[PDB]
Design a protein around this nucleic acid. Structure first.
Ligand SMILES: Nc1ncnc2c1ncn2[C@@H]1O[C@@H]2COP(=O)(O)O[C@H]2[C@H]1O
Ligand SMILES: Nc1ncnc2c1ncn2[C@@H]1O[C@@H]2COP(=O)(O)O[C@H]2[C@H]1O
Ligand SMILES: Nc1ncnc2c1ncn2[C@@H]1O[C@@H]2COP(=O)(O)O[C@H]2[C@H]1O
Ligand SMILES: Nc1ncnc2c1ncn2[C@@H]1O[C@@H]2COP(=O)(O)O[C@H]2[C@H]1O
Lengths: 200, 200
DNA sequence: AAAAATGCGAT
DNA sequence: CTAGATCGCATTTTT
DNA sequence: AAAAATGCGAT
DNA sequence: CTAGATCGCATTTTT
């Protein structure tokens, strides 16, 4: 790709070890991010410390872009590295320049903001409509289709803690587990610890 | 404002009577909207017909913008008119042109997309964290602060059906009502039918 | 050992 | 009435 | 009347 | 155990 190559050339690159945190919530926003390599997680916490995963982002994804359109804006959430991470970085001020040079880039950002709004809205519906069993059953299906799923003679094999399934669908580790036994109880899946084979 | 005036001049205007529907969900997307006057509601329905209000939009708000960045895109939700409505309209194709003429407009769109993502994410958290009492108590507070709230010697007076409070916080008309009696039972509010005075 | 992540029944 | 959450108790895991 | 919107207890 | 939803029944509302 010609454009984004021109873009990066204008960004410093930084790497973050997995589990580290790239964007702090509440903190003043002035920089834009573009994940060159690695995946992360965007999450918001409750007063008590409880977390809720709003999304995962990957290669070719921008981050910290929500405060780019109105001075004195704060980070809307925490962004933690899921894996090692190589991330390009540029200042809004700097970035805004590029925009005026070539608009095509702002068009790339906006598209991601668009797709982002769809899925988050889809997420509002899920919490509003489906029950936790439904929400988990859907997450396993989705995860079983991502690139990090391994092949298995009976379907797909994923590996994830129950804590996270709780932090994705919005329930508690305790409910996830109970639900997980049922789904197996119904030969729908097979779980052993963090390993789950989604049959199909 | 100089820009948006240049914009409208390029859009046909259409009016929609209240309760009518401007954007059909699922339908192919090719047009952009900008509410010149009136307010609307963006909503998604469940398989059974049940509705969930993702948001309300007003004067100076764009609509149907999510399918503007990738050919063959479908409307992500229903958009129904809350009041009479005067709405400017333009085709993506046409709109994209303007972008290349002046980028500033795409910058206005994107900002709204940004703000939109914040609040929807804030909404995901609400459904995940707070209970229905908490979610309703917050809606009444918010609504009591909008421009259509009327002054009252004991606080603010809003007027809304319980069906809607159910469609905003994600509960059922029956739970809203029960919750509403409690909040009054606690001299927090005072409700008579569709009328509610939020004390304070 | 370290450092977390459970598990399931019970209320 | 049923789906979830929070505790009570007993055991198992990645850094 | 039209046309919806409830209300609350009960399970 | 508690918050919600779904039904059972009886009455009240904006077009
Ligand atoms: N309303 C909620 N109730 C319980 N857990 C929640 C809620 N919203 C988000 N969560 C989080 O999701 C997590 C799932 O696993 P845990 O039980 O370890 O901890 C849970 C909380 O941190
Ligand atoms: N719902 C969401 N979906 C995807 N990414 C999000 C969401 N909410 C926040 N983010 C990202 O997380 C970032 C947190 O800081 P910013 O608000 O600067 O920008 C935010 C977005 O890049
Ligand atoms: N999971 C849900 N359970 C119940 N009602 C819901 C849900 N999600 C959205 N709703 C809608 O919210 C509305 C609130 O008022 P009603 O009971 O008239 O009808 C309800 C449904 O149409
Ligand atoms: N969560 C949301 N918040 C605000 N507006 C939304 C949301 N989801 C959808 N919309 C608007 O509703 C429109 C429905 O059709 P489009 O997908 O073309 O574009 C969508 C947005 O303009």
């Amino acid at each position: 790709d010609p454009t984004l190559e021109w873009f990066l050339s204008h960004c410093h690159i930084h790497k973050y070890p997995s589990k580290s945190t790239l964007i702090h919530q509440g903190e003043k926003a002035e920089t834009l991010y573009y994940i060159v390599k690695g995946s992360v997680a965007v999450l918001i916490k409750d007063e008590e410390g409880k977390e809720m995963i709003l999304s995962y982002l990957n290669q070719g994804d921008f981050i910290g872009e929500l405060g780019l359109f109105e001075e004195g804006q704060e980070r809307s959430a925490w962004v933690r590295a899921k894996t090692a991470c190589e991330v390009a970085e540029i200042s809004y001020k700097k970035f805004r320049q590029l925009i005026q040079v070539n608009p095509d880039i702002l068009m790339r950002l906006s598209a991601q903001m668009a797709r982002r709004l769809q899925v988050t809205s889809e997420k509002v519906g899920n919490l509003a409509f489906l029950d936790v069993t439904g929400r988990i059953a859907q997450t396993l299906l989705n995860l079983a289709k991502q690139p990090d799923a391994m092949t298995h003679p009976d379907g797909m094999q994923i590996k994830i803690t129950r804590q996270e399934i709780g932090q994705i669908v919005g329930c508690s580790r305790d409910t996830v587990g109970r639900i997980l036994k049922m789904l197996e109880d119904q030969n729908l899946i097979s779980a052993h610890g963090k390993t789950i084979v989604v049959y199909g």
